[PDB]
Ligand binder design. Structure first.
Ligand SMILES: [Ca+2]
Length: 146
């Protein structure tokens, strides 16, 4: 495969603040949507939908073929207009490689492209923005190894 969506992979472990970690859907089971730079929604066919506090861990064993982990991140726009407040962190082995800082409902999505050469484990974290988990629907749009 020229690219492998995370939603094709099985995780080593996964926690979430609500429900199921959803493959190719938001945590509420909708098409994943994030806030675009034009103010409008951007919809994603593939991705991972979860809820703060969430930690999802993937082994990269047998996936050393790929150069980058790539995803868009943001508050899932099913929660536009709410108190949603989260941050995204990405780890490769035991170091943080991406940190969005605080993102609320109207915060434009961010793109992640981090190199995975020589790494064995990819960990995705969605934190609760320092308040509560209320409305903390965080989605990884187009999340993939490529
Ligand atoms: Ca929050």
């Amino acid at each position: 495969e020229t690219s492998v969506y995370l939603s094709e992979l099985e995780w080593k472990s996964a926690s979430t603040g609500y429900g199921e970690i959803q493959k190719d859907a938001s945590c509420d089971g909708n098409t994943i949507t994030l806030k675009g730079e034009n103010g409008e929604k951007v919809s994603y066919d593939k991705g991972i939908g979860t809820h703060a506090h969430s930690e999802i861990v993937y082994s990269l064993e047998g996936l050393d073929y790929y150069d980058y982990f790539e995803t868009f991140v943001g508050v899932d726009q099913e929660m536009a207009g709410t108190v949603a407040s989260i941050s995204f962190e990405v780890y490769l082995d035991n170091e943080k490689v991406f940190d969005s800082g605080l993102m609320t409902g109207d915060t434009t999505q961010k793109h992640v492209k981090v190199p995975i050469a020589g790494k064995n484990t990819l960990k995705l974290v969605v934190k609760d923005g320092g308040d509560s988990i209320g409305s903390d629907h965080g989605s990884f749009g187009d999340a993939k190894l490529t």
